[model samples]
Target: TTSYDVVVVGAGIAGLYAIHRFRSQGLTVRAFEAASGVGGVWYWNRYPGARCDVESIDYSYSFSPELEQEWNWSEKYATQPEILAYLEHVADRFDLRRDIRFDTRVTSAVLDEEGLRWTVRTDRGDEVSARFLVVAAGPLSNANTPAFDGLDRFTGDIVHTARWPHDGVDFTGKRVGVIGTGSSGIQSIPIIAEQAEQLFVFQRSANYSIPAGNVPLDDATRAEQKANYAERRRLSRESGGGSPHRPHPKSALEVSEEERRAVYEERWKLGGVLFSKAFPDQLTDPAANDTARAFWEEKIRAVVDDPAVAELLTPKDHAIGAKRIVTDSGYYETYNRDNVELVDLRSTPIVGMDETGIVTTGAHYDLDMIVLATGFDAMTGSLDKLEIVGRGGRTLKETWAAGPRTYLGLGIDGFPNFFNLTGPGSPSVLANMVLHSELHVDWVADAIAYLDARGAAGIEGTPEAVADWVEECRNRAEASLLNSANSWYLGVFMPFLGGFGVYREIITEVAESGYKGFAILEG
Candidate 1:
């Protein structure tokens, strides 16, 4: 048994940085990770086409300007393996693995009011106590694979993109069937088609995707990026989109039709996060959103050979940026391949998985491999899994049964000294994660030190403060076109109303509105 001043769960980018930042305050911090190594989400998500939508250089940590200047990225948009390697190097450079216990999954984190500490229990049979429990679990860490009617009986290989194996698979000359056409499916399909003899893509909902003009990072680009690391970090956090590398004061609707097309073309060429900034009102005005959506549809139609296939590819269910703006290198172009086929689950819908393969209204195809790119349980899964008991023996899950409530999306009410890194509110998932993680870690670390110097045993948001934050989050969300309809940010993915927009716009206002409504106690 070991005890520390603070215990953090999940040693991914968020957790590692949190540990590193907090340790400077002389806190005995211990980070528990289920994986054998660091790089939490990056350590596991090794799908064929898994790549970060953010630019490699911009997506990395900028806490140390020296580290930023030294490290080099091979691609403008990094592949899964390359990102994983970068994270491994970060672990070595920062000496972050010392306090991190690899191959340990935290099963429970119960707060004891009498002792005024948290008892962290892990799968490895280790019991550790800490005055603070920080959950640094990544948003996309938990793999959400729905129990398909006949999922168990299927003899073929069943794999979820978020929970891929380390060994990797050889799809050479194999018949592959991929499910879901979200970010993972859109990315993995083209790569999977290259190796597979035949590929079947199962699409439940048509997603709006922009072309990610992914390319290699030249020597000049790398040097220029490193030089402006601080500026880049500032822009990403303060901006509406979370990525500050776009045209300023330019709304898609403001420009003439031809000029708007030129801007879209320019962003398309530049690639990555810039596509979201093609229009300032893309997520705000419906009329503006329609124009951008039409442009995307036109692009898709031009790429796919078949008119019907192109039509099938166009999404109408949600707004353009509603279900996360997915960018792809050659998603639409891949359908032009003779070996590739798009199975529209919306028109026909998925019937069931048989002994042979997937059964759709279109046809049944035999498959050697089955890939489920169903994304993740998202924000709340990792926190809910752990047994966390807060004030008066009230459980964390129980308190958040209606919806997740966090003060500044970092710490919860009554859960003193427990800081969450980009869990729900804040610019997480919306902004560049490296930038978000760094900012959150810095603030939490500062708060911890501030509390210590002031001789405070614990610090928590009061009931009134948490409620006000939640309202502020909702009100800000209502201003944007994002909360007008259902999306992941609004809790639609969680399958509950009043769930989405629990964080983003609300926190932006909170930070901008001078940190109001927080009650710091001397307890």
Candidate 2:
């Protein structure tokens, strides 16, 4: 195992940035990427109709002024290839790939108590040692496909939206079946319907999706955004949703129904992921949430021509913003087309996947293709994939058997000098991912510098600190609509349900006050 100053466990935006940031500190860095190249999730999630919900200008890194000024985004909602191309360009500009071991998956990391160094082993049989180890796998890296009995034997083409083929699937004139109506399903369903002769949406649950008024960004608007990017980035860090769009200052109940409708109308038209953040109280108070929920129900009814389809598509179990609200281009209206059919899995659940098509409890629909947009195990799926052993020979998987625990949502209690970017106990998937990844990378790099400057071995979350932080996250999430749905955000642990801007302030304060809730080890 060759030794290095730092070892990073991903080559996505977070991991890629970590390489640049740490190297600037004169630290020798080695990075491992599971994929063949950089771009992280963007590299793999190349499914059709896969476009970002976040705007192009705001979702990118603000760390480099020259990078921001030089780069040009062609659309308001950039598609997958465009996003991937930008990241590829970034990798080239920063000269990042030489230090990165592509096609290498880090399987295990063992910490040496004597030196406080971590020896990370990859699937390729390379053991790389480092003084510091950080996980930038983020939440959405791993695709979570169910082990259905007949998937291998299924006669037609089977694909997941998260890990679509790079060559792309030809849905034209084929009968396509789609499963799971989460963001991936919602984003791609309409596009699939347009190409396929017959399309069936096998939805186990319905999610609240907003219209994404995607448009090409002209030169003037692009120039205008580049000019104002400075203030825009500031507001993004200050706001909760990780963009310039902050929650409305008023509670829905504080305003009249007419006023609420007017506000909802504006947010609905001026579309993005901010529909959930329409009001401050929308995520907490039921009365406040219902006002927003009712507005959506009305919109759903208005958008879809069929009453039955509209009723089926409307989410019933959770309140508005409870689940991650999907942003889409004419998703609900897609059901109005004669080619598209919505099959509610609640009534006719999938019994089995077969050679011909999926067999539900009630009936069987023959199809040529099945698209699994079931989604990734968010926050910790990628983290759970590795066997990370920490202090006292206790594995991180064992510690997190029940749920994940972290002090700052950055470091684990037992894993000293180890960090996870945009992980659980933080607003990982709740906001614009790029901003959060930047914040995590910056924070981790700074913390390492702090330790090195002081001749401190490293820092790990204290047991007391982790317990306190877990409770801190729970208390903050309990009052909100975050845990209402059985979403990835609801499982083992809750994400810091407090707004991102608020989270930024808390992390900043903690660092300022001598890294509260963490234990520093002297060299």
Candidate 3:
């Protein structure tokens, strides 16, 4: 085993930044990435019509003015390939790849009580011991694939949107079955229908989606944003959702019917998942939420040619923004195509897969291929998969058997010198991932700098701090209707529903107070 000051897992945006930031502190570091290069979800999520829901300009790094000025985004919403290219450029720009060992997945990490060092092992029989172990695997990296009996027996080709083949699949004249109508399913359906001879969408639940007003970024817009970049970055840190997005002060219920409808159309045309920002109470109050739901009902009815299909597509169970809203280009309109069909799995669940195709309770649809668009476990799955044996021989999974507990979503109790970047209970997936990564990386780097300068061996979250943080997360989640939908946001905790701006201040204050709530492990 080699010795170092820190060992990092994953080479996504978080991991790359961790390497750069840690090394910038003059600490010896090594990073291990599972993939040959950074996928951070964008690398592997190469499905047709795969584009970011967030604006391309806002989703970018704001660290270096040179990098921001040099690179220009082509579209309002970047496609998967464009985002991947951007990440690769970032890696090269900062020389972040040298310390990262690609294609080596870290298998286990055990705390060595002797110096509070972590002994990390990988699948390739390599080991490294370090004063700290960093988990930057990120939430979206862990794709959840449901196991169906006879899935292996299926004659059709199977692929997960998260693990899409680099060469890509051509569905031309192929009978395709796409399961799950989350972001991936919504994005790829319209595109797949264009080529697939027959496309069957197996939707688990009807989702509230707004059409993405995706367009190319013109020169005027770029120049405008470039000049305003400095203030934009500052406002991003102060604002929620990783952008200066402030919802209207008026409640949906307070607005006149004609005015509310006009506002709904305005935001609808404006696009992105933030359409719920039209009113303050749309997500928190059912009465206010009804107006949104009713508006969408009219919207969906007008789009889909079939009334039965429209009814199946309309979401009725959850309030708007309860579940994360899916942003699409032509998602609802795809159902209008004669070649495409919608199957409501909640009404008629999938029994299993057969050699021919998917066998649902309603009917058996034969297919040449099946695309599993089941979303990631999110926030904690990547970390949960690792064997992180902490003090007293308890694994990280065992420590969080009931639920994930963390102080500021950074430090775990009993896990000294271990930093989980944007882990559970953090405004990670809830906020713009780019800013979220940089903010956490900076925080982590600052914390380590403090420990190193003071000759401290390690730091662990105090039990009380973790308990309080967990309860605060629960309280915020319980208070908001965003928790009602049972989306991935509540997978561990209601990560957002509480504002990121508020969360950022709390963490900053804690850091300013000499990393308060963390027990410094002094050797």
TM-score, per-candidate, Cα-based = 0.92, 0.97, 0.95
Clashing pairs in 3: none
**Per-residue lDDT tens digits of candidate 2, residues 1-523?**
4999899998887888999888988988999999999989888888877888788888787888999999899888888888899889888988989999999999999999789999999999999889999899868855557667777778998888877888888899899999989888998899999899999999887889999878888899889889999999999998887889866777889888788888898888756478888898888898788888889999999989999989999898688887777789989989999999999999999888888989999998799999998676757788889888899999988888777888868768889988888888788888788898888888888888888888999888888888888888888887887666465686554588787889888888877777888889976
> Please, what are the lDDT tens digits per residue for candidate 1 over residues 120-213?
9989998999888888887775556756666675778887887777787778888899998888888888888988899899887888777777
Please provide, for model 3 over 434-464, each residue's C-alpha lDDT reduced to its tens digit, 9 standing for 90 to 100.
8888888888888889898899888899999
Candidate 2, run of 10 with poorest lDDT: 485-494
Which is the leading candidate under TM-score?
A: 2
lDDT against the true structure, per candidate, is 0.75, 0.86, 0.84
Error of 2 at 324 (Å): 0.6
Question: Regarding lDDT, does 1 or 3 come out ahead?
Answer: 3
Candidate 1 has its poorest 10 consecutive residues by lDDT at 492-501
Stretches off by above 4 angstroms in model 1 are 246-250, 492-516
Report the error of model 2 at residue 498, Å. 2.1
- lDDT winner between 1 and 2, please give it: 2
